Amino acid sequence: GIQKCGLKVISSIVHFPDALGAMDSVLHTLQMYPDDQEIQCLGLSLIGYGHLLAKILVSSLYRFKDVAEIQTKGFQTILAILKLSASFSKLLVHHSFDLVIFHQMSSNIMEQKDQQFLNLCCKCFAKVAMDDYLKNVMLERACDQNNSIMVECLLLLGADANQAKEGSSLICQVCEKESSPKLVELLLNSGSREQDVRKALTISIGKGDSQIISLLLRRLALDVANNSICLGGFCIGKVEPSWLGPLFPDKTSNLRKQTNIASTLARMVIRYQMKSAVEEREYITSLDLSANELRDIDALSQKCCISVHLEHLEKLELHQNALTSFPQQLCETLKSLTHLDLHSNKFTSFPSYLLKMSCIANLD
């Protein structure tokens, strides 16, 4: 309980006569009096004047995530180190820096007037994300923890989302961790290969999700420009109305604008990136369900949420499935189906109520 006084003395003389194992002892006094007496933990201030320095910063700020304006003394130190040893960032991201920089920029800093601070933290973040590889891990280590705000920032800064293992990648991972629908929507709308999104179905098909599936089908099979749903080649073991629901268009759907938060940080970082680089109706019709091995389609023959968009189908394909006994109730619901084909199924009798359909042609 004297180290506080020792560091308080060192802080004075470290300034005036241009002092020159100083940094050594002032580091161990942290590990000697950690997680307590934040006054001696303000010593971080002197560091602004062996990777142990990294492991002692991210562990200090994290353990004091919302303690006081010691983050302002922490990040000032981290910013001072970065502008002279640019390599240091490879060490921060290597540790728990992600755990501490994602919290600050998302701890309700928006709606709070700490603009002086955020401009510091974004300036510090502007350098951690310089390297092309670091963004690819600043991003990946922001998907495991569900963080929609930051995963959107690292995308507006590059950091391709189709790089992890190629056979396996983000979207396959993000679908395993029971993520949030807002998180998947950002990987697909950005660079994301088809061969990886398709593998995300079978992963997300095994589990029953109504919003993580309907976001993959919307990117895999929906030709909005031609009013179609091309779900052919997919080996979806079964179709349910809760998935196709959000695919059909809705006129009432209108949203606010909330992603502007991640858009502000995207340019603020880009601003500090350059300034440091310069100086120095329309009801859809076609619905294809060809190769999906469906042993039954009854799930659609109810009064579910899509029973009002199926009445304008005008084409429906179920060929190469393993269907049987086309449901009586369905063939009276879609009263505008004019091109129905269902061949290679395992039928054993003509339903003979298919002809009761209102306006049908080209029954196959």
Place this chain on the structure above:
Amino acid sequence: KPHNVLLFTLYPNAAIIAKIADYGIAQYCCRMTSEGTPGFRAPEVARGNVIYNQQADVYSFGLLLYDILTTGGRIVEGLKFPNEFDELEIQGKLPDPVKEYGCAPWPMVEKLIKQCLKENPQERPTSAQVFDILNSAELVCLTRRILLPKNVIVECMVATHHNSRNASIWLGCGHTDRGQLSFLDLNTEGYTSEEVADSRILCLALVHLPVEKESWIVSGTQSGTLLVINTEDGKKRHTLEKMTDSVTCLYCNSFSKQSKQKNFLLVGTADGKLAIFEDKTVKLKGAAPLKILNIGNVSTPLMCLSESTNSTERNVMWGGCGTKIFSFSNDFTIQKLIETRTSQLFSYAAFSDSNIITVVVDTALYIAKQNSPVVEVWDKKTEKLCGLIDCVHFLREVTVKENKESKHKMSYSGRVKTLCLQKNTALWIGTGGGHILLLDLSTRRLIRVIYNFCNSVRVMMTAQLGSLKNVMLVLGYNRKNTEGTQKQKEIQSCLTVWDINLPHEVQNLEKHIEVRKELAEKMRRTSVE
């Protein structure tokens, strides 16, 4: 042939769609149809007197583009005239894909056909070129280019959206000092001439009335004669109350504040005497200017007008005037008088000390000045320069190696002439040169610069055409220095029609090629592995 192309899926934004059957060449390269099917055949291969070349698969591919364009119209008729199915094409005498078979024009591929359909073998584009000009994302959106008659100078246009069965574009005229309107269809392309005034026209607007099933057009001319003619009858005209200066900007609004349908019109005089009117009173000769709001002075001419993007805030209008930007609402009084000349980010001054040209309304404000290569991102509330987007910061980055002579051209040409903002995606900037800028206002600035299709993009605006809505009319220019030594230029105005989905397509296609390049290499590894 259209029989050797094996589709894999009918989803447009897929990775593997078409695949040419490759077994045919294996059976030939071993057991050596060597002349090719009659209909889908080159002239150099049918005559049989000359060995083939790689330029034979291009003429055969050129025909494949002719059957995809016309959706197999030549083959259907070619089955009952097979001796004329081959000989008609065996010389490059096959007809126009549009005049014969009903199909959408697609006028940047009717040119690729007319190249792959040339008689001389080494004059047809090699296979590497026929793909590098299909990879362009501007070929797949340009819906139809409409060559206006020779030497017609138009600087104003207006579309008809209350009739969605078909549409027409009412133009103006500049090649005469006495003004004249120039009606123009879209499916027949019949350019019509009808003199309607004695002074050159500057802007028009289209006022429709929900009653009586008509939509008159209004004409602003330099003299001030505000004339109105009916859509059908080209004889019932009444020159409204003449103004004092040259009308420069008109508009038709959405102001239905009497619990029913009602609308106004805002004649923008060349000093700010904005006369407001009513939608149904336009018929009467000499209507009543409701609230003439003299805003600026004779040294402050209005040059634009706009309306909000959302309808929630009651369509707050934001119109420019001289260099002073203003706004109003149902009150019809100035509620903001932002001024731009007093800008504290001076690198050059007169870019802000000049007349305004156009302003678009969004979550921010984008403003254009005369001969200004920069747009100014102001804000509504703060009234500050939140963004300054210079043009040549993008043009000079592609015009480095492909343009070498420009080193003497430090007095660059190409200035912002018009703004048009897509709903929420991108911002269309028409440069004084031949370029057009696609700026994604959300995240990334430069999407693509679509050059070498005109010479001066003078007018640009959106419209909706025959239930295929959301097109982007682009009225450029074209000048050829045939008699430049006679201090005269031959101007050819070239109206085009871009699919408004262009900023998506250009970045949706650039991903489509990346995924296929990543597959073209991994497929080369299965050979070594």
